[PDB]
Structures are given as structure tokens and as C-alpha cells.
Write a protein that binds this ligand. Structure first.
Ligand SMILES: OC[C@@H](O)[C@H](O)[C@@H](O)CO
Ligand SMILES: OC[C@@H](O)[C@H](O)[C@@H](O)CO
Ligand SMILES: OC[C@@H](O)[C@H](O)[C@@H](O)CO
Ligand SMILES: OC[C@@H](O)[C@H](O)[C@@H](O)CO
Ligand SMILES: [Mn+2]
Ligand SMILES: [Mn+2]
Ligand SMILES: [Mn+2]
Ligand SMILES: [Mn+2]
Ligand SMILES: [Mn+2]
Ligand SMILES: [Mn+2]
Ligand SMILES: [Mn+2]
Ligand SMILES: [Mn+2]
Ligand code: NA
Ligand code: NA
Ligand code: NA
Ligand code: NA
Ligand code: NA
Ligand code: NA
Ligand code: NA
Ligand code: NA
Ligand SMILES: [O-]
Ligand SMILES: [O-]
Ligand SMILES: [O-]
Ligand SMILES: [O-]
Lengths: 386, 386, 386, 386
């Protein structure tokens, strides 16, 4: 039961299962993993594909020869297993040069370097098949107020994404960008801190059609936000180009628990939403097996990501299929929410005494929403207590 | 010192100083205030104007005669004092009819009523001089996941704001809308929870030019966000149509402390930003004198809002004017942040070996940002310890 | 399935199901409930008993005649249904007199009044059978720093609880006190903000044996804390005299969702802990049916509290009973956690080279904890996916 | 102005200014510092002393010869400068062996090793003059619910601290322990998450007099708590043995900003409290110069810690000394808070009709607390706007 297969589109970053366990207070607890080993183990577990930062696949500073060798062995593992690479990204955060940012570093020379580093890896991503190129500007931001003029930083951010769009347009590449918001960590505050801020920013780019969001469960939860609601807004905008799935236990450091852990009910509502919306993209896990775990625990945690998605998918489908739930949704007027408020237009509305002058507010107010019965059906379905 | 005058554009809602002190666990501690008294007392304190919800100025359910009488006495007080009304709004949250929303209530008849209630008060706002009409959808949202289909709710929200835009266009009115985000409270999660989400939503409206944001200090802080940064993004987008100033002591219920209270350093950076950007709009306080206070404390707290803005304005101007700060900003490369990254374009950048092949990442990395010295100059200026 | 009966010890406050729906931004959505109706409806749903504040049972300011009448009808309903009253409490928060506190109000006369109000209701609680008397000092605290000298306030708090202990000792009463922490709301910060602070405070009382804690799920979660962990510390201390069960969706205003809602996994671990510890006390729900609901939704939400406890109880028992889980617990060394570290004493430990000089830290470090496999068994059990 | 001298008791951990800048997403931005260099630079800046973890002073795994050499050079630097060592601690968090804890690791052999590692460094701390030995159990806790039985973990924690107390008693050493709470990070939840939990735990130790707390500004703020209030409770309990001073920008990862940064008003109220209470202990900064900074920024940030304490000390003293503030405190009944509520005892209170029967609750309720005027005097003093 709940056995993943490539059909399910589950993907993982090299840096997820490959996390060695270093944290702000801790040295590594596991050895580095060869990307080839990761491709093989994930294929065996039923994954569809793998994603990478440039510097996860090719060690930073590699010579051209060394680079080509790391790429070759990775391609052979992908080719052997049938694993895909639907997304890739750039590491614009680890190297000390990026301490004040990549695209919004105060030093101009750093901004230019960030763009070149990105462009090099776009070319590689395209060859390997990626259709989405993620950008997580984890160093874009500040710890103090005068360090970063945010209006000017947004000018630089826009400039950078507009040039990237000019580059992929001039190359004829198919690939789209997905901007990943995060509220904080490793900067005190990160620019584009939520899905909304990223969506808004995209609308000022030259070619907005080339850009969407890559929201992450835990990131929105680091602002105490409702991740399903934010995904709904991204879907409403036509901008859910990719997603990062994991768990997070509230407002704290980015934990990257396996998917299903953390806010379990939010995981359920997320799966419900992705499945009813027909999201087509990868089901990508950006998670970290806790550093308590050895390599066997790494693979158990990765398998758990997929298993939990599949359990939740089953529960959400059962919920929506249940005639008792379909009736409860009507009792709660979810059908009526879909009716246009005033298709009849402004003049009709203004002349309609049933909308104001003769509207019985007390009788409307007295009508319960029946949301608790509805939500207890959802609870019962999630828990298998039906 | 720090004496406000109408020149300073300070405004207050009737519901701010007029808050009787009811809270989730508490009955009123102060009597209702006559709006006439409020206009007179605020004028005496140096305010520029006053704002209102419909139902603050005219009791809900008033007959047409009663309505006209409340409006008349208010207009006479405004006229006597020279107090202005730069903004008004609708109460779509208190009456039980709005328990599931106004514009996104599941019941269609409620949605229509919300629109009529709004339109009636738009007409009054325009007569009284308001150039901004705020919409805070405090009941739009949910406590449970199936209660609200957020994509469909956003359809209804858009429909509602688009009709309002059609109405003010057809009337020839000058007035613009300002959508006020809030993450939660009184709903478990509110739709459009942050500045970013509101900015993004506006870009899908039919006439986006008619809509901006009304961010509130405490609201963004209820998501742990950096309010100055969010204001910078709103300014960058050209959408800071109005602002609500107050204080908030972290991630908790909406406190509505007087401005300057709560996160004092964020208040400083906010004033610094508004003043350097040349924000033109009202300096509106959406605050509540704590229910510990009697009426004398109400006016003291309102005076404190204005005093703190003026102190911070002085400190921020001194900071920016200090040659030592101008030098520290250069040391931190804030000047260089304003240089275009690659005005020279994509082909130049790609051919520039100083951007990649020959870029000395270690020498760049070793260059400190000098942000701590800069921030300690800012601290010294805020504290008057210069 | 999952049908509660009085054997299950579920209790509810009059003020829970009886909440009329007033919130900081909203008028009542439901009529007041007669306490007699509440006793009858809860009995029908399978509850064991009911709790009250003084002013929920007898309207504030009632004459002695009126008081006696409200008590009489309540006692007859209890007697008719076999409903019990295991706990009662005082309302030291609603009336404006308590705006700065009850026991720690700055005004001495208010402190004395708070004590008299409490003592009167202790006598009534004892007659009705309560064995625990809760004290939630919701007004004890501050919005500003100089308003409350916390050391002195703690002196007053101790004085007050010590006198209450002298009173119940002199009366020979059996009843114990349970102090309820909360971090904030309705004060900006509340004194004794968490389980730990309350536990610590109790240890400075004259008769600490008379006092324990009444932790509430949502309250600890308003500080982002792990409620099961805090309950474990209270149990470890022998101080879990009562508990308030509900749900909370993160760090925000006190939501009082039905139990099971909010952090579902924390609800599971809480039930697991209460059941393995053999907690004997009432399973008390301090929750609010959302104001979206009519009276039928009130009773559905109350029934859902009990149903969710019973589902979780079944899942937790299945988890602990599963041989595969018992093996995983051994694999994770939960058995070894129960072995004394050094029963052998200090000199042995210091002479034991296997503890230091000859301890192979790398071989120990390499041993994974197997916590992910364990936690996925727990997930599978919770979801019924076993 | 605001020049620190050793008289001011400012101290710093080796690991503070010596932080190389590694974060969860970042490699080091600065070279390791020689502890000798740190002692000399801090002495030049006006510090009083320095603190250390074992493994900051002596690299982990050093031979006995190497150990003795690192100690010798450190002692000579201390002796040359007159720098003191008032506190030391053990690193029970970095090495992978501690991935599930030190004293509460599930593996018994790890628990024993943790104790031996601690005892070795207690002996060194005592020789160097430390009067407080801090214990921050950063690895004690869990990411998942069944991984850690918290009641049993608390048994192990108590066992460990009781043995340490037996050891220092048997050695005749003068030194006391200070337990440092933290809510999370690097564990998902840490045991003893707040000041209150630590205070409560101490009261179950065999020799409670040997143990106090070492609260850290940012740690309590990671739970959204009021740090001054928690310090007041620790002082009330007689348990403020040491303190860690820094800044934190709300509920997020542990930032370790310089003192004064983050919540500036809380820093003011903290200094006000420490100075009025006559806290005698070190003014210890547990902070990290941001990794944006080079070594010159490191020393600027350290100097800023001390400068901000001294500015705030001046402002708080001016506030308390101001006759206008002394009058406002009376207007707010802070004097009356210090009067015993009922020194007259229970029978008097019960017979006193002015406390209940004849208490005019409405006249008391109507009396404003005047807290806003008081708090605006505090604001004016902090800002130097008096
Ligand atoms: O918080 C870290 C981020 O989630 C990244 O892993 C991005 O997804 C890719 O750089
Ligand atoms: O949280 C309440 C909101 O701040 C409102 O006061 C809006 O500004 C106006 O309806
Ligand atoms: O936040 C409100 C509290 O939870 C109360 O309901 C107490 O439990 C009883 O006064
Ligand atoms: O969060 C890290 C802690 O603050 C430590 O630095 C302790 O103070 C000493 O181990
Ligand atoms: Mn993450
Ligand atoms: Mn991610
Ligand atoms: Mn507000
Ligand atoms: Mn507002
Ligand atoms: Mn509650
Ligand atoms: Mn409660
Ligand atoms: Mn810290
Ligand atoms: Mn510390
Ligand atoms: Na490789
Ligand atoms: Na573009
Ligand atoms: Na009026
Ligand atoms: Na429009
Ligand atoms: Na009654
Ligand atoms: Na006592
Ligand atoms: Na050394
Ligand atoms: Na002991
Ligand atoms: O992540
Ligand atoms: O507000
Ligand atoms: O509650
Ligand atoms: O720290």
C-alpha cells in the first residue's frame, strides 16, 4: 500500500538526502553522498527525479575537466535508472562572497558574478531536461535597517531577473523561473518574504510570463501563514510553477521535516488542493533527514515523504467523494460561493431592494454556516475514522 | 518641542480614541464618544483629520432622518475646526451577518449586501472629501480548510472590487481604494494576509490603477515580517495609498498600541523610509488607547502617537544628514547598490571575464560590509547619544 | 464508534458551548444559553460534567435571592442528569474593575475585592463537588514596562494564593487550586506565561501541596511551545491537577478551536501521554464553537471534541501495543533512556575509563537513532494506514 | 561618553567575537581567532572578562600536552591584561556524539561521557576563577514525539545535575550552576524551554541552592515572551546567577544580534530592572557579530554591546530619578502595588464590608490607570526627548 512509482512525480534535491547534518550548533553527522548513489537509491524508492544546485553536482571551483566528469557520471546514473531532472537551481548563498546577497549584494561585482554563475547553470539545467529553474534568494535581505535600501534592492532584483529572461529568450530555451520566498534565515529578514510578495514582484518584471513561484511549506509557516491558502492564491494567479514539500513545527528556524510531519492538517489540505486543482508539476521534497539519523534513516525519511503524500491523497479523495461531504459542502454554501455575486452588473445591484433596503440581515445572520460538521467529516476522513 | 500641527497630516479613526475597551475577555471600560467631541479634541491636539467606518459615524440601522442628523452634526464639527476627512471605510465585520465575510461570504445574498453597504458609504466619503477608501476584509477567510475554497473566494473578491471600480468610474469620482491586509484575527486565517498578497491580488483586477494598499504596522508584525521592508515594496510598486500607524509587541493578537510602542526600531526605520520616499499621504493612527485608561489617558495616548512620529522624524533626519553616516553608507556600499548591475547588457556581461572567469571571489568575500558600525550610528542617533 | 459516555470523564465549561460569539471585531452571533439547557444537552452527548465561572452561573451583581434561584435550578439539572461539577473558577477578568488585574491589580482595594469574590465562589464550588479550583489570572500583567513591577506583583500574587490556601485549610475543604498560565491576551504580557513559570511560582507558596497547574493546549502553543512536553514536565512534578483541551492554529490570538483541530499531531502525542501516565482528572474542553455556527453547530463542535479524544486514544493505544513499535522504540534506545546514567555514583563514574578516556565517540556518533522510522510508524498509526 | 571600563563587569564568550560565520546555509566568513588575541582585544575595549566552552579554549581531542599548552597561553593573556573568567561551560552540542543530547541522550554511554566531559571542565573553570558554571542543554529534546519520553528524560537530567552537585560539594568548590533555557534550535523542541521551566526543574534537584538560571534575551524572545518579566521572576526566586545579553528580531532562529539591537524597548526595561534590583553578576554578551562583518566589524559590534548597555543604563536612571516619573508612578498606583493586600489576615478580610458588600466596583473601575502617560515619559527618556 502507498507504494510510490515514477508516475507519482516525486522528486528530491541532491542536498536533501545528501545533507550531512551540519546545523548552527553542530558538526556533520553523516558522510557526503555521491550524487550517483543518490540517484540510484531514490530510483529504488520509487522517485521520478532529482534536482540540484550547481554546487551540489559539481564542487565549487572545479576545473573544466573535473566539471565535465561530475556531469558525465551523473548523466549516466540518470540514464541508467530513468530518473529525470525537472528542476535545477543555483547556490547563491553558501560561499562567503554571497554574504550580503547574490543579485542584491551591495557590491556590484558580486551581483555580476551571481548572474554569471546562474547563467552557466541554466545552460546545464536545460541540457538535463529541467523545465523550471528555481531562484531562492536566501542572502537577499538584512540584519539591520540601513544596510539595505529595499527599494533599490528591488530595482537590482528586477534588473537581474529581467536579464535572465532576456538570456533564456535569446537562447530559445523553454525553461521558466520559479522564485522561492522565505521570510528569514539566513538573513534577519529576506526580501520577497512570502508567496504574496514574490507574486507581486513578478508582475513588475519585463516578461512576467516567464516567472512563477516555488513556495515551500515550511517557509510560509515561518510567518505563521496558511500554506494551502497561499498555494490557492498562487494557483489563482496561474503561477504555481513548482512546489517544495516538507514539514515545519511552527514559527521557528527552518526545520525541513519530512512531508506530513509538522502541521499534518495543513499537509492534508495542501494535497486536497493540489489534487483538485490538477497541479501538474513535480511533487518535490525539500527536506532534511534529521541529523539524528544514519544513512538508513535518510532513506526511511525520504520514503516517508512519499508515503505521506500518497496516504493524504487517498484521504482527500475519499473526503471529496463522500456523498455525506458533498451534502455538508452544500449545507455550508460552498456551492453558492461559486455563483457570481452580481453578474447582473452595477445598475441592477443598485436597484435591487433585496440587496439592501429589504434585506433581512437578522434572518441571514441566524443561518449557521455548519462549518464544524463539515470539518469533523474532514477530520474523520483524515484519520480513517469513517 | 515635537508639537504636532495640521501641517503634519496626522489623522485618527473615530474608532481609535473612541474604542470603549471591549476585548475578548472584557466589557467596556469607557463610555462611547460623540464623534463631535472626538473631532474637537483631536483638532486641539494638532491633528489634521479624522476617518470613519460607516457605522462609527451613523449607528447601524439608522433611519434616513437619523442618518442625516448624525452626518450634519459631524460636518459642522469638521467645518468649525478645519479638520479634514482624508479616508473612510465600511464596517464589513461587526454585524453577525458578516460572520463568514462580506465580499467573500459563502452566502450570495450577503455578498450583495456587503457591496451595497460599501457603495452607500463611498458616496458619503466622497462628499466629505476622502480621497482614499479603505477595505479591510477582516471576515474574509476561515477557521477550517473546507469552509472556504480560496480560489473561488478570490474570484468573488475580484468580482466585488471590480464592480466597485466600475461604480466609481461611472460616477466620475477621484477616490482610490486601499486594501488592508491582515494575517489573522478575527478569522483563523484572513485572505490577503500580507502586503505582498494584497499587491499581487491588485494586479489581477480590471482597473489596477484604482487600487493600492493600506498596510498596518501591527498587521505585518503579526506574521513576524519587517514592516519597513513591506512598505518599501509597496512604495516600489507605486501602491502606498494610505498607511495605518501603531505598535505591536510581536506575534500575538492585534494590540493596536500607540505608534512608537512595540517595535521601536521598526518605527524609526519606517519614519526614515516614509520621509526619504516623500510619502504624501495621511499619517493615520489605527490604534487603541489601552482599556486601562480613562478618557484623559485616551488623549494622552493619541498625543503620544504624534509625538513619537515627530521625535523619530527628527532622529531619522539627523541620521541621514550626519556626514559620519553618509561616509558609513559609502563604506557599506549603499551607493554601489544603486548602480545598475549590467546596464552594459547580456552579451557584454557574458564576455566580461571580470564577472566570472577572473573574478577573485576570496578578495571580494574578505571585504567586510561594515554594517555594524553603520547600525550603531543609527542606534546612537535614535537614542540621542551623539 | 467513538461514542462518549460519562465513564470517559469529559467536561465542558458553561462559557464554552455558551459563548455567544462576541470577538474583538464582532457582535454576538448566538443567544445566551440557560445553564440548565447546557447541562441537559451535554449529558445527552455523553459528557461527565460541567464547570463554571461564578458569573456564568449567577449573573454579576445578583441579589442574594436571585443567586439562590440560579443555583437551585442548576443543582436540579445536575441532579436530574447525573452530571457532575469537578472544577469551578472565578471570573477575575470581564468586569472593568479588573482592568489592571485581580490579585495583582495596582489598586489595593481591587486586590481585596478579587479575593472576596474568589472565596465566595470557592464555598459554592465545594458544595457542588468541585475538587479543583482553577485560577486564570488573565488580567495580571501589562502592556507597558513601568505599569507593573513584576517582582512586586509576584509578591501580591503569592500573598493572594497563600491566603486562599489558609482559607481552605481553616475550612477543612479537600479542594486544590490549579493555576492556569497563558502568555498574553487580554494583557500584552500575562504573568506566569507558561506551565514552567506557574510550576516555579507554586514552589514559593507557603503550602505548595495545595497548588498545581491547569495547562491549556492553545495557551502553550501561543508561545510556540510543545504542549505534550510541558504536560510531561507537569506530570513529572506531580502537578497536573486539571487540563484544558482545545485546538490552536499556531502563534496568534487564542482561538479555542475544538480539541483535535489545530495541531493534530500534538493532540495525538498529548493523548498518548495522558493515557500512558494514567492521568485521572477530568478531560475538560475549554473551547469555543466558532461564531460562524448556530446552536446545532455548537453541539456538533462539542461532540467533535470528545470524538477526537476517543479516536486519538484508540490510535495511541494501537501504536504503543504494536510489536513493530515496541521494537522501533528499542532500536531508538527509549529503553536505555530509562536506565540510570550513574547509579554506580560519582567515584565510580570518575574511575570508569569507558566513560571518557576509552570511550569511542566516533562509533557512538555513527549509530543512528532510527527516529524517523519510529515516527513514521506513529504517523501510520494516527492515520489508520497500518 | 559611554566608555566601558572593567568596573562595568562586561564579559564575552570566546565563541561570540570568535564566531567564524558558519550558518545553516553558509560557510565561514572570518578566520578562527586565537583566544589570546580575543583576551587582548576585549581588554582594550574595556571588558572585564571572558568566558569559554571547553572546546573553544582547547580543541576537541587534544592530547594532555596540547591541552596544557592552550591553557597556559590563555592564563598568561588573562594575567597580562587583568581579564577575568567569571563563567565557563561545556560544549555538549557540537560533536556528532551529542546528536540526541548529552545528559538526556537515549544512549547511556553518551550520558556518562557528557558528565565526564563536564566534570573535567568544572575543574578547569574553578582554577581560572569562574564562580558560575553554565549548562545549556541545546541537544536535549526532540524533533518527533516518540523519540524522547520527556518524563524519563527529566529523570536523567535531574540525575545528571544531582551528580554534578555531589561532585562540587565533595570537592569543596564555591561554584554554582546556571541552567540556560532555550525553546528550540538546534532541536525541534528543547527541554526546559523557558526561564520558568528551568526554575521549576531546579526545585526538584537534591541541592537546589546550587542551581540558578542563565537566561538569554533572545531565547525567551524565541517564545515571544517578555524577557524583563522573566528576569523579574528569576530575581523574585533568587535565581539570577548569570545572564546572557544580546538582541533578537522576534520569533525566528536564534540571531544573537548585539545587545540593544532587536527589541530595543525590552533592552531598556531589562537594564532598568537589573540596575534597580542591584544584580551583581557579569554583564555577559552571548552574541555573534553578523557574518557580513570582517574583524574590524567584530570589534565594533562587541563595543556596541557595551555602549548600548551604558546608554540604556543612563536613560533608565534618568527615568527613575525624574520627579515627573516618580509622580506618574504614584498616579498609576505603583506605590500601592507594594502594600500588602491583606496583612490584616483572612478573618479580617472576610469581615470587611469595604472589600465586597460595600465595595463600589463602578467607581473603582472608572479610575484610569494613567499607564499611557507613564509610558510616554519612559519613551521620552529612552529617546533623550526630555
Ligand atoms: O531554505 C532553503 C531553501 O528551501 C532552498 O533549499 C531552496 O529551495 C533552493 O536553494
Ligand atoms: O484590525 C482592524 C483593522 O486594522 C481595521 O481597523 C481597519 O483598518 C479598518 O476597518
Ligand atoms: O483564555 C481564557 C482561559 O482559557 C479561561 O477560559 C480559563 O480557563 C478560565 O477562566
Ligand atoms: O543558543 C546557544 C547558547 O546561547 C549558548 O551559547 C550557551 O549560552 C552556552 O553554551
Ligand atoms: Mn526550508
Ligand atoms: Mn526550498
Ligand atoms: Mn490592528
Ligand atoms: Mn488598520
Ligand atoms: Mn484559550
Ligand atoms: Mn482555559
Ligand atoms: Mn542565542
Ligand atoms: Mn547563551
Ligand atoms: Na558529483
Ligand atoms: Na523579465
Ligand atoms: Na454620530
Ligand atoms: Na477593477
Ligand atoms: Na443560571
Ligand atoms: Na500557600
Ligand atoms: Na586556545
Ligand atoms: Na542537586
Ligand atoms: O529548505
Ligand atoms: O487595528
Ligand atoms: O480559553
Ligand atoms: O547564543
Amino acid at each position: 500500500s502507498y507504494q510510490p512509482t515514477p508516475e507519482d512525480r516525486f522528486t528530491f534535491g541532491l542536498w536533501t538526502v545528501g545533507w550531512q547534518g551540519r546545523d548552527p550548533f553542530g558538526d556533520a553527522t553523516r558522510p557526503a553522498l555521491d550524487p550517483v548513489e543518490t540517484v540510484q537509491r531514490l530510483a529504488e524508492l520509487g522517485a521520478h527525479g532529482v534536482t540540484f544546485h550547481d554546487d551540489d553536482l559539481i564542487p565549487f571551483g572545479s576545473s573544466d575537466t573535473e566539471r565535465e566528469s561530475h556531469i558525465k557520471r551523473f548523466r549516466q546514473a540518470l540514464d541508467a535508472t530513468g530518473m529525470t531532472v525537472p528542476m535545477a537551481t543555483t547556490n547563491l548563498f553558501t560561499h562567503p562572497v554571497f554574504k550580503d546577497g547574490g543579485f542584491t549584494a551591495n557590491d556590484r561585482d558580486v551581483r555580476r558574478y551571481a548572474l554569471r554563475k546562474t547563467i552557466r547553470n541554466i545552460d546545464l539545467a536545460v541540457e538535463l531536461g529541467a523545465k523550471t529553474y528555481v531562484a531562492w534568494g536566501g542572502r537577499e535581505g538584512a540584519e539591520s535597517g540601513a544596510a539595505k535600501d529595499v527599494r533599490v534592492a528591488l530595482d537590482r532584483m528586477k534588473e537581474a531577473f529581467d536579464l535572465l529572461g532576456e538570456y533564456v529568450t535569446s537562447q530559445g530555451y523553454d525553461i521558466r523561473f520559479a522564485i522561492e520566498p522565505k521570510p528569514n534565515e539566513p538573513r534577519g529578514d529576506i526580501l520577497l518574504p512570502t508567496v504574496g510578495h514574490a507574486l507581486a514582484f513578478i508582475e513588475r518584471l519585463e516578461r512576467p510570463e516567464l516567472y512563477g513561484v516555488n513556495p515551500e511549506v515550511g517557509h510560509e509557516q515561518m510567518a505563521g501563514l496558511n500554506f494551502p491558502h497561499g498555494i490557492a492564491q498562487a494557483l489563482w494567479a496561474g503561477k504555481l510553477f513548482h512546489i517544495d514539500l516538507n514539514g515545519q513545527s511552527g514559527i521557528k528556524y527552518d526545520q525541513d521535516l519530512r512531508f506530513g510531519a509538522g502541521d499534518l492538517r495543513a499537509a492534508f489540505w495542501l494535497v486536497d488542493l493540489l489534487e483538485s486543482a490538477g497541479y501538474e508539476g513535480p511533487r518535490h521534497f525539500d527536506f532534511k533527514p534529521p541529523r539524528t539519523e544514519d544513512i538508513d534513516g535518510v532513506w526511511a525519511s525520504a520514503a516517508g515523504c512519499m508515503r505521506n503524500y500518497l496516504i493524504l491523497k487517498e484521504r482527500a479523495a475519499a473526503f471529496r467523494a463522500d456523498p455525506e461531504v458533498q451534502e455538508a459542502l452544500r449545507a455550508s454554501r460552498l456551492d453558492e460561493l461559486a455563483q457570481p455575486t452580481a453578474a447582473d452588473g452595477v445598475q441592477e445591484l443598485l436597484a435591487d431592494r433585496t440587496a439592501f433596503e429589504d434585506f433581512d440581515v437578522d434572518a441571514a445572520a441566524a443561518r449557521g454556516m455548519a462549518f464544524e460538521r463539515l470539518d469533523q467529516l474532514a477530520m474523520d476522513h483524515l484519520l480513517g475514522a469513517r
